[PDB]
From Swiss-Prot:
One of its GO terms (molecular function) is G protein activity. It is linked to Leukemia, acute myelogenous: A subtype of acute leukemia, a cancer of the white blood cells. AML is a malignant disease of bone marrow characterized by maturational arrest of hematopoietic precursors at an early stage of development. Clonal expansion of myeloid blasts occurs in bone marrow, blood, and other tissue. Myelogenous leukemias develop from changes in cells that normally produce neutrophils, basophils, eosinophils and monocytes. The keyword Hydrolase applies. Its main location: membrane. It comes from the Eukaryota. It is an enzyme of class 3 (hydrolase). The modification N6-acetyllysine is found at residue 105. This is GTPase KRas.
Length: 170
């Protein structure tokens, strides 16, 4: 089978995890998607000449059992850590996501990309510099996106795949 990349989108409720995933998979912006729904989506794509499958888990937070959370973190190869540029709390939550994923996988080298969503809004509480400062400390890429206009979306997911490749080659 073609190579499959298991990607996990995490982040506080309302940041745009679902909008981002649906924009990537289906090429349209969904204004309203039930915040409590969590599912996986698939799309066959070509990244740097490689035909591959993206298998993406659109997370929604607490699970029936915490074991389910741990299971998808061990299963996931790469993680989009999403905050919204007008939601400071969501940006502060990144610390917890970074920590928890590393903790569950028991690894210091987990492919991640920092994603600042809703870049189409002039309303902003989190400056680019402040997110760059965090990304720098993590040694991971940072990309500002808009699920609304699609700006940065392919870049976000494709960069995460490229981070997975760099991890695999070690
Ligand atoms: N303006 C703007 N709104 C967005 C963007 N992404 C998501 N939203 C809106 O933010 C709200 C929550 O998005 P959603 O995908 O459900 O967030 P999630 O809970 O993290 O999946 C919805 O009303 C979306 O329409 C974006 O890039 N720009
Ligand atoms: O399916 C759900 N949740 C859920 C929870 C954990 C899951 N793990 C997987 C396996 C998977 C598919 N693609 C992935 C990419 C990264 C990590 C895990 C997966 N599906 C999952 C679906 C809920 C229940 C009713 C309908 N939505
Ligand atoms: Mg959602």
């Amino acid at each position: 089978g073609m190579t499959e990349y298991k990607l996990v989108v995490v982040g506080a409720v309302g940041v745009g995890k679902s909008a981002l995933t649906i924009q990537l998979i289906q090429n349209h912006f969904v204004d309203e998607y039930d915040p409590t729904i969590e599912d996986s989506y698939r799309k066959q794509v070509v990244i740097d000449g490689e035909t591959c499958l993206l298998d993406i888990l659109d997370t929604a937070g607490q699970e029936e059992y915490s074991a389910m959370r741990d299971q998808y973190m061990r299963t996931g190869e790469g993680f989009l850590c999403v905050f919204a540029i007008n939601n400071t709390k969501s940006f502060e939550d990144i610390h917890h996501y970074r920590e928890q994923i590393k903790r569950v996988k028991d690894s210091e080298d987990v492919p991640m990309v920092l994603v600042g969503n809703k870049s189409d809004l002039p309303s902003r509480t989190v400056d680019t510099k402040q997110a760059q400062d965090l990304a720098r400390s993590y040694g991971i890429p940072f990309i500002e996106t808009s699920a609304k206009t699609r700006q940065g979306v392919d870049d976000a997911f494709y960069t995460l795949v490229r981070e997975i490749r760099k991890h695999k080659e070690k």
